[PDB]
Amino acid sequence: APKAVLVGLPGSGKSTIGRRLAKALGVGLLDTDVAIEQRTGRSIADIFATDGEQEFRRIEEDVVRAALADHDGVLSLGGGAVTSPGVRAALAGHTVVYLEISAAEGVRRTGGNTVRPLLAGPDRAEKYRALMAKRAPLYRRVATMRVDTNRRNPGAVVRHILSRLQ
């Protein structure tokens, strides 16, 4: 089982906190977005473009179940993995860290970024708020620990998690 599984919205810091947390614990980071691109040979945007979200979600659930069984380090899930009921069921029993972020800050963290299909293009603040309203209940449901990241720098987030683990 991973030492920690990180969930939350795009820009909440999964990739960032995951890397820093894994370094701290001296384990590997498995980022499921990365794992998907290495598996398929394709970019996430290109899977979404040609195959669509539903196919991305099926591939993502396969990857996630396997990593939950086989990975003993830190595991960072894609931001929308919790929208899959099978991912949510696979997460039961696991140490799941919900990185919380306000929409205003989340928007600003993701602002330069053009590699997220569900956020790209215009009207980003609206789209982000809509994602947060849909998913917040789902993150809260799978989480065993919640960490507010709005006013915390990444090293402080890591230390907060470290102190609450194990």
Ligand SMILES: Nc1ncnc2c1ncn2[C@@H]1O[C@H](COP(=O)(O)OP(=O)(O)O)[C@@H](O)[C@H]1O
């Ligand atoms: N606690 C934080 N304080 C400041 N910036 C952060 C924090 N967490 C993440 N970031 C920044 O936000 C951006 C998105 O982080 P990322 O780790 O890729 O989020 P996710 O994987 O949840 O999409 C990155 O530039 C990262 O440096």
Ligand SMILES: O=C(O)C1=C[C@@H](O)[C@@H](O)[C@H](O)C1
């Ligand atoms: O919010 C989402 O559904 C996504 C977030 C990213 O982590 C990637 O998994 C992908 O762009 C989908």
Ligand SMILES: [Cl-]
């Ligand atoms: Cl399984």
Ligand SMILES: [Cl-]
């Ligand atoms: Cl590991």
Ligand SMILES: [Cl-]
């Ligand atoms: Cl299950």
Ligand SMILES: [Cl-]
């Ligand atoms: Cl984007």
